[PDB]
Amino acid sequence: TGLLDGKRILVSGIITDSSIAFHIARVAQEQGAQLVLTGFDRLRLIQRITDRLPAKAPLLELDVQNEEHLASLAGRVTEAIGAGNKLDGVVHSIGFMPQTGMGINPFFDAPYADVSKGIHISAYSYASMAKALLPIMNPGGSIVGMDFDPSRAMPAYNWMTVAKSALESVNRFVAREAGKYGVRSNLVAAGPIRTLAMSAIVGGALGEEAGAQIQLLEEGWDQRAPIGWNMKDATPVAKTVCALLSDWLPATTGDIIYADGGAHTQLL
Amino acid sequence: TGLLDGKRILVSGIITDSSIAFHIARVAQEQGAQLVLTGFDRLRLIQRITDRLPAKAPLLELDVQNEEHLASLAGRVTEAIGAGNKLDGVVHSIGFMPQTGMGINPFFDAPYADVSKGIHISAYSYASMAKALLPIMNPGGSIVGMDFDPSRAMPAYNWMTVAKSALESVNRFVAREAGKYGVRSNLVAAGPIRTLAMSAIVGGALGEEAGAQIQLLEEGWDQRAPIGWNMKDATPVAKTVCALLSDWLPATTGDIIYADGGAHTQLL
Amino acid sequence: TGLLDGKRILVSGIITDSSIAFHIARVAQEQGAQLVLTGFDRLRLIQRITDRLPAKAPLLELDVQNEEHLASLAGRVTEAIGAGNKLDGVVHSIGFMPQTGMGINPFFDAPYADVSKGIHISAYSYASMAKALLPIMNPGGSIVGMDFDPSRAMPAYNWMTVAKSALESVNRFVAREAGKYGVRSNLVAAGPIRTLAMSAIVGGALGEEAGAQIQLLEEGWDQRAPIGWNMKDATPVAKTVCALLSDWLPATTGDIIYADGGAHTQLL
Amino acid sequence: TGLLDGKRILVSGIITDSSIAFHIARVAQEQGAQLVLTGFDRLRLIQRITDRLPAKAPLLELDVQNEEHLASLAGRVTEAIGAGNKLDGVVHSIGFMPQTGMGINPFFDAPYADVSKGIHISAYSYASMAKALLPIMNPGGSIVGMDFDPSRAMPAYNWMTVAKSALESVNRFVAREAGKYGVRSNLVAAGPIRTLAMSAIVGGALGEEAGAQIQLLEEGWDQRAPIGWNMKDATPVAKTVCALLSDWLPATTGDIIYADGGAHTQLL
Numbered sequence A, B, C, D: 001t002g003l004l005d006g007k008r009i010l011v012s013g014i015i016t017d018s019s020i021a022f023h024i025a026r027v028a029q030e031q032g033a034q035l036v037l038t039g040f041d042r043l044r045l046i047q048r049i050t051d052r053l054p055a056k057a058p059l060l061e062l063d064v065q066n067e068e069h070l071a072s073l074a075g076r077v078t079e080a081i082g083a084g085n086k087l088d089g090v091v092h093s094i095g096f097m098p099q100t101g102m103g104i105n106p107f108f109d110a111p112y113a114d115v116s117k118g119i120h121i122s123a124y125s126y127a128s129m130a131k132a133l134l135p136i137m138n139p140g141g142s143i144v145g146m147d148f149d150p151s152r153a154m155p156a157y158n159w160m161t162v163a164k165s166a167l168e169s170v171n172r173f174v175a176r177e178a179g180k181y182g183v184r185s186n187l188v189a190a191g192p193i194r195t196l197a198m199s200a201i202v203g204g205a206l207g208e209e210a211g212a213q214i215q216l217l218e219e220g221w222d223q224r225a226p227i228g229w230n231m232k233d234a235t236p237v238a239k240t241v242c243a244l245l246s247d248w249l250p251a252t253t254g255d256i257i258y259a260d261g262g263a264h265t266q267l268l
């Protein structure tokens, strides 16, 4: 009697035990969902990481920049879940921006090839995954992507923020297409989460000024949040993704749910 | 094993079997919640209506314009739920705007006394109820109010839209106060629902032009909604309110969840 | 050859030489506009203040809560400007919230009578003035109101923020009515301005905590603003109001122009 | 005594006499501005078109996808305006999306190479131009870009809408950089304009369904606009761009001004 009992859900984006997708996968399994996982490039690493999940789940390779991986994806998922079975859910928890597009590298100094790669992975791939998976999704189904509120510019995030603005726009169009299948498409805008990369950035991996700026942003976020914000805890974000994967928000689509402690609703 | 098992929830706003609050109360009970209901003025009528709910629930009188009703409310709820017990949820499903403030009566012709009454009932009362109930709410608790997207002006709704804009602002402040109790505060922005009053308006109860305009708005809403919009079905709205009353959106506060078929995310 | 040469403009809201309306009136006159001023209650004081403006301007009494003042307003303006002449512009620079609705007084402790008075003056009066003045405005005309961005809740501002949210909604409806006259209606959302009342608040006139909170908000505003924000200088705000009164934004209506140093477009 | 007397302004984006940039250039010249024009690929055509402007203006080649054109741009402008002189204004009126990214071609069928080209030209180039031109702009200067409101998804526009969402995000970051030079950066969100390409689209150049959908969008736009919307008249848009190029909106940056007849503020 979990929130997601009997649901078949694809979860992309696990790389480490601190990935937001690891926690989404863990909570979905705690809630009775049967998962299919997708991983990029380091499959041996991802398998060892996913071995820590409450239940076993088939892992499929998916490089979103690879058209062959996308073209074979639905067939590979069908084989993993069994012929005649379809997905009820899809989680996009994929994001990347080359170092030139984030941090202390001046915003104007990011070459377009780098920005384009980041936009391909972080925004266009949300449409790529929906195109590949909608033909194998059941009516009442749900597609969820991870967002970081890009409504206002912020230091260091730079082109990653531009990619999120593009992602929010993509989500509204994916919802139009997904609707033809009786499927919802939404994003969860999370507050900052101390993933391995976020800790490294605050530690100065992308320059001192950028680290200092992200640390101030994190502190301000918890201060603004009426219920507080714990950057070390991805569970509230994972629960929110599961809320969207469930039958409990059936009239919400092309939309954004903020799992940010309410920080975006307050100025100070 | 319902979504709201063991939760004690107050639900205001039932007047007819077509009230959005009736459906919120029905779904909350189907999901294991123990309810306390509040009713305005016509208690005998409300009791006969609520007798149709899946389970028995104490009904308390609450006129939000009456300071004595508000001052005695927490004590009356405690008596109904038993000393030592507190509420986990509160539903505000209250709205009113005198006839001069809605319909064919020109927007400029609404006297302030009428607008002020409508704003008192539809917006200020969200803060009034939170003030009365927060001292008897448990941490992890949830306050939910009903909204109708007032981001853009629309024909006929007139001062009711102004009252909703004020309500959205009130919600952000209530979240600040509710946070001190470990309580969330959010609104559900519903698409148009064919309540008794909505059917009467489309039928011309507030003038021909206003009826024609609201009918066009309803049609456009379903056309824009990527998953469609059924104005005759309050169930998707009721489910969304229950999603907010549950433990599944724990990092969302001072916010608005749109249960509108995704219509507000599309232009055409 | 001023920006507003030959335009007849009504300007309300002058009380001191630090009123935003004093600077709007000064810049409009520097730009060739012929003004009619309205004042509340302290006409002798207002006249002595307005004697400092670059040019002489008739001053009319206007209490926005007084229906007789509103009913006689168009006739009184016509007498001041001459029969056969109409206004090209109207400036609403009126705002009030009783002490219980702002500052350290808890948000929940503001009685409705106080909130309603504040909403009457700060929001409903924008519609009251447009109703009175549209019959004496020329096509191509412009109505401008003063806003303080209420999209996110903030400390101390409390019910004044709720009143601004209501004002933004009122503006969108006033635009619908004003359009029938070929008239535009818009708000200027200013950054914080050190008026006499703002200085008194920071100084602790409405409690220590509220003063400290508003001082932090002011500092954050200049820090966020990509071009900086000088709270001691109302000139950039006055220039923006004149931009809206001019023929230079002819396709903008029911809208909000932010004269806030760009602070609302940045998170940090 | 024009609005832009003595200002040196670069205007990009003229291709035909129906280009929005042609009208921006015409109004800026009527208002006393001294222009430098940039053109893409068809310089002989652009020169013959620009010969119709009120005054002579040097024309420089600028392909925004060409790093050499961008690297030599400031030097070429300085040569055209004279050593010791700098620009007061910059107009970005550049947009492109390959046919696969707009129209009847399904949203999912646009290959990334096409989307990336469109995003390069329509969004990234706003940052490219600011990087090249800020070192030759005077304090008090203004950068203006052309936007088409992408807040909600719409039929046919597809990836062009995604590119506009990315552009709005880019604008907020450009404002941060431009602020260091005492320069403002803003976008004008225009209503639909019957350029040669728009007429061809409505005529079915990108498929019947797309043409029909854009025609419905145009009709709805004028219906919603409280002051109406004339798609055959770029003058109100050109005037708005000049308002931003002037000294009259000195505290507005990282922002969006809507020259859309107020259509985006109304639902119906």
Ligand SMILES: NC(=O)c1ccc[n+]([C@@H]2O[C@H](COP(=O)([O-])OP(=O)(O)OC[C@H]3O[C@@H](n4cnc5c(N)ncnc54)[C@H](O)[C@@H]3O)[C@@H](O)[C@H]2O)c1
Residues within 6 Å of the ligand: A012, A013, A014, A015, A016, A018, A019, A020, A021, A039, A040, A062, A063, A064, A065, A092, A093, A094, A095, A096, A121, A146, A147, A148, A189, A190, A191, A192, A193, A194, A195, A197, A198
């Ligand atoms: N960490 C935060 O503060 C934060 C905040 C809000 C939203 N988000 C978003 O959450 C999502 C997950 O990120 P995270 O913070 O868990 O970091 P992460 O590094 O753990 O997850 C990013 C994932 O993207 C994958 N990926 C990269 N390139 C790929 C490709 N070519 N094909 C397929 N997958 C590819 C990586 O392998 C990794 O699994 C991202 O969309 C991120 O932007 C993160």
Ligand SMILES: NC(=O)c1ccc[n+]([C@@H]2O[C@H](COP(=O)([O-])OP(=O)(O)OC[C@H]3O[C@@H](n4cnc5c(N)ncnc54)[C@H](O)[C@@H]3O)[C@@H](O)[C@H]2O)c1
Residues within 6 Å of the ligand: B012, B013, B014, B015, B016, B018, B019, B020, B021, B039, B040, B062, B063, B064, B065, B092, B093, B094, B095, B096, B121, B146, B147, B148, B189, B190, B191, B192, B193, B194, B195, B197, B198
């Ligand atoms: N019907 C729609 O299309 C629609 C759309 C979105 C949101 N909403 C909102 O949903 C909520 C419920 O409205 P509904 O559509 O179910 O209509 P309804 O008439 O069934 O419910 C309104 C309720 O407000 C109560 N109320 C009025 N004055 C009161 C007072 N002084 N004290 C206490 N309660 C008082 C009424 O008794 C009634 O129970 C309202 O906030 C409404 O604005 C309605």
Ligand SMILES: NC(=O)c1ccc[n+]([C@@H]2O[C@H](COP(=O)([O-])OP(=O)(O)OC[C@H]3O[C@@H](n4cnc5c(N)ncnc54)[C@H](O)[C@@H]3O)[C@@H](O)[C@H]2O)c1
Residues within 6 Å of the ligand: C012, C013, C014, C015, C016, C018, C019, C020, C021, C039, C040, C062, C063, C064, C065, C092, C093, C094, C095, C096, C121, C146, C147, C148, C189, C190, C191, C192, C193, C194, C195, C197, C198
């Ligand atoms: N000061 C700021 O930081 C700030 C920021 C943004 C917007 N604004 C807005 O600018 C406008 C002008 O305020 P200000 O800051 O110049 O303060 P102010 O005190 O100088 O101006 C407020 C004016 O409202 C008038 N008023 C009050 N009650 C009235 C009534 N019954 N009838 C008619 N007029 C009445 C007062 O007489 C006064 O002239 C207000 O709308 C205010 O909210 C102020």
Ligand SMILES: NC(=O)c1ccc[n+]([C@@H]2O[C@H](COP(=O)([O-])OP(=O)(O)OC[C@H]3O[C@@H](n4cnc5c(N)ncnc54)[C@H](O)[C@@H]3O)[C@@H](O)[C@H]2O)c1
Residues within 6 Å of the ligand: D012, D013, D014, D015, D016, D018, D019, D020, D021, D039, D040, D062, D063, D064, D065, D092, D093, D094, D095, D096, D121, D146, D147, D148, D189, D190, D191, D192, D193, D194, D195, D197, D198
């Ligand atoms: N037409 C509308 O309905 C509408 C509405 C709102 C905003 N806009 C925007 O206004 C701007 C001007 O477009 P328009 O409608 O006048 O169409 P247009 O075709 O007349 O202008 C587009 C311009 O972009 C130029 N361009 C394309 N690729 C380029 C490159 N590689 N380098 C440099 N310049 C390049 C073209 O040469 C052309 O001059 C665009 O940003 C467009 O999206 C248009």
Ligand SMILES: Cc1cc(C)nc(SCc2cc(C(N)=O)no2)n1
Residues within 6 Å of the ligand: A094, A095, A096, A097, A098, A099, A102, A148, A160, A197, A198, A201
């Ligand atoms: C909002 C947000 C913040 C961070 C640090 N990573 C992410 S996605 C993960 C990631 C890592 C990198 C990188 N440059 O290593 N780029 O993207 N998204």
Ligand SMILES: Cc1cc(C)nc(SCc2cc(C(N)=O)no2)n1
Residues within 6 Å of the ligand: B094, B095, B096, B097, B098, B099, B102, B148, B160, B197, B198, B201
């Ligand atoms: C958004 C929306 C629409 C309607 C018809 N009623 C409501 S609340 C119910 C109601 C009824 C009335 C009335 N004038 O009878 N005023 O308010 N809210």
Ligand SMILES: Cc1cc(C)nc(SCc2cc(C(N)=O)no2)n1
Residues within 6 Å of the ligand: C094, C095, C096, C097, C098, C099, C102, C148, C160, C197, C198, C201
């Ligand atoms: C946004 C903003 C801020 C302030 C201090 N005053 C205003 S209007 C002026 C005013 C003064 C008072 C008062 N309580 O004296 N209420 O309103 N508006």
Ligand SMILES: Cc1cc(C)nc(SCc2cc(C(N)=O)no2)n1
Residues within 6 Å of the ligand: D094, D095, D096, D097, D098, D099, D102, D148, D160, D197, D198, D201
């Ligand atoms: C919002 C909007 C609408 C249109 C028709 N063109 C533009 S920019 C001009 C353009 C033309 C094309 C094309 N595919 O020919 N792509 O972009 N922008």
Ligand SMILES: [Mg+2]
Residues within 6 Å of the ligand: A051, A052, A053
């Ligand atoms: Mg294991």
Ligand SMILES: [Mg+2]
Residues within 6 Å of the ligand: B051, B052, B053
């Ligand atoms: Mg019964």
Ligand SMILES: [Mg+2]
Residues within 6 Å of the ligand: C051, C052, C053
């Ligand atoms: Mg004098």
Ligand SMILES: [Mg+2]
Residues within 6 Å of the ligand: D051, D052, D053
């Ligand atoms: Mg010529």
